[PDB]
Each structure stands twice: as structure tokens, then as C-alpha cells.
């Protein structure tokens, strides 16, 4: 099949590649006993203004994003840099939960690299944002007859907000030549403006509660998804998932001693040569499973069809046998 010809002339042909196939799989997450408080950020009576968006830090807990993904209440859930379905497994060294309220048409403005008043002066995401944005209409909570003016937004920002920057300044915006000295008037406008949320407004002006989950993926994982830690296996070609780092290799005891802070070590190859097991601070080295090139040595098919094989750069273990250099 390799030569693509029925007749094979005398010689050695590197027909195939021999890969030791792992049989067992090991999943070890941090042994942390707590549930991350998603409800507090989400199930909150009142949200902060977009210009002063609130930020919660989630750490030292076990997160479960399955509930959030499965929930149908969220009007729009868009994840950039991560799969909402696969969120269940990924660990995170740090989680930020930003919360605020905008109007429906501004929901799009909350996206990586987006523009507009909200994105430019209220809340800007980085180009390499790695997280999710979940927005849901709050017309039954953030709108009153006569206009709910509790929520505000920055309109005239002299300096464009940098990513993950919050500007609560209330300095009168001087849009003219003469200064204002804190005095409003013409060419001197208050930087903030209020949404008069009313239940009769169109969906474009209707209120929407927006939660941005920003993940840091790298360091020890303060937050990990729900999973069942399993017993590790030494000296066996197995799949492994250490703290969310996925790999396939032999997990062996390592004489080399990491520094107390050090968790994941990589050599010039930059591969995760060794790992630190979360359950026990035991440094486990990783070696690629024996791989080689199966070279078929065949005399010409005319002479005979008996064929020898040569596994390259492997011992006669993983495979009338001859061990040569």
C-alpha cells in the first residue's frame, strides 16, 4: 500500500509508524470542597451601572458551569476563546465576574474589540479576551413605569477607556475651548447619562443584565470544574489530565525536586516535562511513550513473500528476535 504497487522490489521500506497506545486514563483535579457562588453575582437584587461595572473574584471554590450553560433563561451566551460545552472540564487559575446593566441594542457592544459608546467609554474587552458574556433581558426588574433612572452610563469620555478599565469620574466634560472648573453649562456637560428604563420601550431600549466571566488560563488552579479525581498510575502509558493540563504519557516518579512555588516544569522542548499532582505535592516526570518507525525489510516479491520487520530506536520489549543498534 505504501509503494502503491503490487510488486515490491528488494529493499527496506519505511512502511508505517508504531505508536504505543495508552490503555488507562487518569483525571486528577484539585481536591477542593466548595461551590463557587454564581448565584450571588447572577441572582442579585440590583446591578451596578455600566460606567461603574461591579467585579467579583471567584476563587478557592469548585465551579460548575453546566448549570449556567443548561439554563435557558440567559438570552445570549457567547463565549470567546472557550467552548461553553467544554467549560465543565477546564480549570482556571483566576476567574473574574463583571456585572452591569445596558440596553438590548448595546448587548453587541460587549464583545472583544467592539466599538461604540459602551465599548469605548464604559466597558472594553481586550482583543485576546478569553471568557464568556451572558446577557439576559431584565425588563421585569430594571424597568419601572415612568422610567427607571437608577442605571447610568458614561457618554462623553475625554480619554477612551482601556480594556478592563472602570471610569467612575464625574468631572464635567469640557467640549469647548474655555474650561469648566466643575461648572456645568454649554460645552460643559455631566459625563454620565441615565437610562430611563420604561416597560413600554422597545427591546432595543429594554434593560439587560450582563455578566462577563473572564478566565485566566496558565499556576495553581483556584477554580476547577466538577470532576471525579481518580487514582494515579506510575509506570504506565496512560492519558492524564493534571489540573486541566491534558496529555498522554508515562507518569513516573522523578528524583528532581521542584522549587516550593514551582508547579509545571518544561525543558527546552517546552513540553510539560514534569507536573505536580494536586492531591499530593509529588513531582511526576513525563516521558513520551515509545514511538518508532516500522520499516518492512522485504526481499523481492519475485523471490519470496517472507518479510522481516524493523522497529526503529526501540527495545525489543514494547513490540526469533535480534536486538541491534
Amino acid at each position, epitope marked *: 500500500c505504501t509503494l502503491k504497487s503490487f510488486t515490491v522490489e528488494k529493499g527496506i521500506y519505511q512502511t508505517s509508524n508504531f505508536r504505543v497506545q495508552p490503555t488507562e486514563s487518569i483525571v486528577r483535579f484539585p481536591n477542593i470542597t466548595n461551590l463557587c457562588p454564581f448565584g450571588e453575582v447572577f*441572582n*442579585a*437584587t*440590583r446591578f451596578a451601572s455600566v460606567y461603574a461595572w461591579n467585579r467579583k473574584r471567584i476563587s478557592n471554590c469548585v465551579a460548575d458551569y453546566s448549570v449556567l450553560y443548561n439554563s435557558a433563561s440567559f438570552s445570549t451566551f457567547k463565549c470567546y476563546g472557550v467552548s461553553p460545552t467544554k467549560l465543565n472540564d477546564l480549570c482556571f487559575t483566576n476567574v473574574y465576574a463583571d456585572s452591569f446593566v445596558i440596553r438590548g441594542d448595546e448587548v453587541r457592544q460587549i464583545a472583544p474589540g467592539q466599538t461604540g459608546n459602551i465599548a469605548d467609554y464604559n466597558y472594553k474587552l481586550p482583543d485576546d479576551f478569553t471568557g464568556c458574556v451572558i446577557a439576559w433581558n431584565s425588563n*421585569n*426588574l430594571d424597568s419601572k*413605569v415612568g422610567g427607571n433612572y437608577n442605571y447610568l452610563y458614561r457618554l462623553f469620555r475625554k480619554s477612551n477607556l482601556k480594556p478592563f478599565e472602570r471610569d467612575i469620574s464625574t468631572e464635567i466634560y469640557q467640549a469647548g475651548s474655555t474650561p469648566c472648573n466643575g461648572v456645568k453649562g454649554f460645552n460643559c456637560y455631566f459625563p454620565l447619562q441615565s437610562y430611563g428604563f420604561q416597560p413600554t420601550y422597545g427591546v432595543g431600549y429594554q434593560p439587560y443584565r450582563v455578566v462577563v466571566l473572564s478566565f485566566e488560563l496558565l499556576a495553581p488552579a483556584t477554580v476547577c470544574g466538577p470532576k471525579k479525581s481518580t487514582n494515579l498510575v506510575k509506570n504506565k502509558c496512560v492519558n492524564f489530565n493534571f489540573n486541566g493540563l491534558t496529555g498522554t504519557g508515562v507518569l513516573t516518579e522523578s528524583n528532581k525536586k521542584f522549587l516550593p512555588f514551582q508547579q509545571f516544569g518544561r525543558d527546552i522542548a517546552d513540553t510539560t516535562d514534569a507536573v505536580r499532582d494536586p492531591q499530593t505535592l509529588e513531582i511526576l516526570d513525563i516521558t513520551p511513550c515509545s514511538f518508532g518507525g516500522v520499516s518492512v525489510i522485504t526481499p523481492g516479491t519475485n523471490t519470496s513473500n517472507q518479510v522481516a520487520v524493523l522497529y526503529q530506536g526501540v527495545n525489543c520489549t514494547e513490540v526469533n528476535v535480534f536486538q541491534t543498534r
Partner: antibody
Amino acid sequence: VQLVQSGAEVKKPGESLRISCKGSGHNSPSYWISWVRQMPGKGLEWMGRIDPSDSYTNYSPSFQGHVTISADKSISTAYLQWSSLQASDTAIYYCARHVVALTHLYPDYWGQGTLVTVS
Amino acid sequence: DIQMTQSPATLSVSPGERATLSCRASQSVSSTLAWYQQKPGQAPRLLIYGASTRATGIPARFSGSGSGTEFTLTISSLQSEDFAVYYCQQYNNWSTWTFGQGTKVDIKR
């Protein structure tokens, strides 16, 4: 989900008083515990509400400068306090809860009420 | 504030019939209304919330409807334990929660 109020109180006019109502089993630290008055033969009348996490009051206009509503989230308790009691304050006071369900609100439990007699 | 007015003041319905109560608000309240039941000597009990959703654990004979300023509570097949005073309370989030005066349900005769 459970709210427990204090026992019935009897006070002379002008005496300060504070009734308590402890909550448990709440969806999140940001809920709405509210007080309602009920005179012997009158109907239901809202007084105010708090979110213990924020401790943000929304006193009713008819009860703004008459009572003070406070909260302690460490014990998940709400308190309704009269600085100076009067005979008109004699009534049954209930504490109700209003949890948040993302899309909308939901009142789950209603307090048994505490009878206050100013005389 | 948003004044809530109920009707009728009192009614009289035989068991098995359908009782109807109306509730009106001064200005709209969207659908943030709740109906309660307060039997003599008992604390108020929620029946309907959101002006249409039946509270869990309540008999299905109770139903709510309406929107805006006008809402209605219907008790089909009135029972012998349904005699109480029913109020309608609005709970708009950024607003003072107002209460109606209530309506009394008694035996027809």
C-alpha cells in the same frame, strides 16, 4: 426557606422597641426582606424592605420617619425598630421575603407575625 | 405611589361556583402583581404571582389573569376552606410596594 420572628411585645407609649426576624435558606445573599403591618381590623400595608447584603432600605412614604429597618447578614436577621412607640403602633407585624429569580422576583415565605401592644 | 383598589368589597358565593375578584392600579404595573389569601387568624398565603403564575402547592382551581392596570383572580369550584380576604400587591423592583384593601369571600344565602 424559613423565617422566624420574635415573640409578642407589650410596651408603654414612648418606649423604644425592636422586633427581629431571622431568615434562612435564601437563594443568594442579595434578597428582599420586607415588613408589613396589620392593625386588628385593618388590611395589609407595606412598610419597607432591605437587602441585607447591601443593607439598602426603601422605606414607605407613610412610614419613612416613623420606624427604622436594619439587618445583620452574619446572622441573616432583620430588625424593625421604633424609637418612640404610640398607641397607634399596636398591630401585628409580619416579615416576608422576596428572592430574585434572574428573570423576575419571587416571594417564597411569609412570617408568622409578631403582635405589638402599645399601652 | 401606585394605588391598588379591589372589587367587590365583599361577595357571597356558594360552593362549586366561580368567584371573581378584580384589582386595579393607578398607572401600569406591567405584570408584577401577586394575590394573597389571609384566613382568619392565619398569616397571608401567596396564591398567584406575576399576575398569571400559580404558586406551587396551591390548588389548581385558583387562576390569575390581566395586565397593565387591571387584573383578575378567579376561583373556580369554590370550596369550604376558601373563605378568606384576598389582596393584590405589586412589587415593582425600584418602587414602593403598594397594597389593596382586600375583598372578603363568604357563603351565598
